Amino acid sequence: KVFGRCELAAAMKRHGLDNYRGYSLGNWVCAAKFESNFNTQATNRNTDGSTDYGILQINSRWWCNDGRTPGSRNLCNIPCSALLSSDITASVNCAKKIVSDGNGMNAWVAWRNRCKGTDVQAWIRGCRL
């Protein structure tokens, strides 16, 4: 599913992401925009052989099992396929573990490079929340 901006903001807010570990909703929407272009089905293979899955491009080396990432952990205890669903519940639950892990939203390279220190409120402007 390719989400609209406000449709995703709404779904993320419902699932507890607005100010989760102090990160405003706009941060989470900006990160999804630059990680996945709001496409739940996005996958991207990494040079290390790991793959990034779903709306927030969650990595198979640490977070999910895809059965082809040697020496990988599955810290969110889910198949990576679960992260591609039109239902974002699994991606959100795993994002909460990732953002709690010590580097906060710097875990998302597109967030650090394209959202961090920007007017992220602009990503939720004109949305009914």
Our finding on whether 7 is near Rh ion (CB under 5 A) is no
Q: How many residues line the site for Na ion (CB under 5 A)?
A: 5
Which tokens sit at 45?
């293979």
- Please calculate the CA angle 119-116-26 and round it to the nearest 5 degrees: 50
101 is an annotated ligand-binding site residue: yes
In the structure encoding, which two tokens stand for residue 94, read together?
């795993």
Q: Considering CB distances under 5 to 8 angstroms, the limit depending on partner class, which of Na ion, Rh ion, none binds residue 101?
A: Rh ion
Is 7 marked active-site?
Answer: no
Taking the complex as a whole, the smallest distance from the CB of residue 56 to Na ion amounts, in Å, to 16
Does 60 bind Na ion (CB under 5 A)? Our answer is yes
DSSP string, 67-85: S-STT---TT-SBGGGGGS
Catalytic residue chosen out of the listed positions 7, 18, 48, 52: 52
For Na ion, give the closer residue by CB, 40 or 60: 60
Is 59 one of the binding residues for Na ion (CB under 5 A)? no
Q: Is 52 a catalytic residue?
A: yes
Going from the C-alpha of 22 to that of each of 19, 68, 96, the distances in angstroms are: 4, 34, 12
Q: Binding site for substrate: what residues are annotated?
A: 101
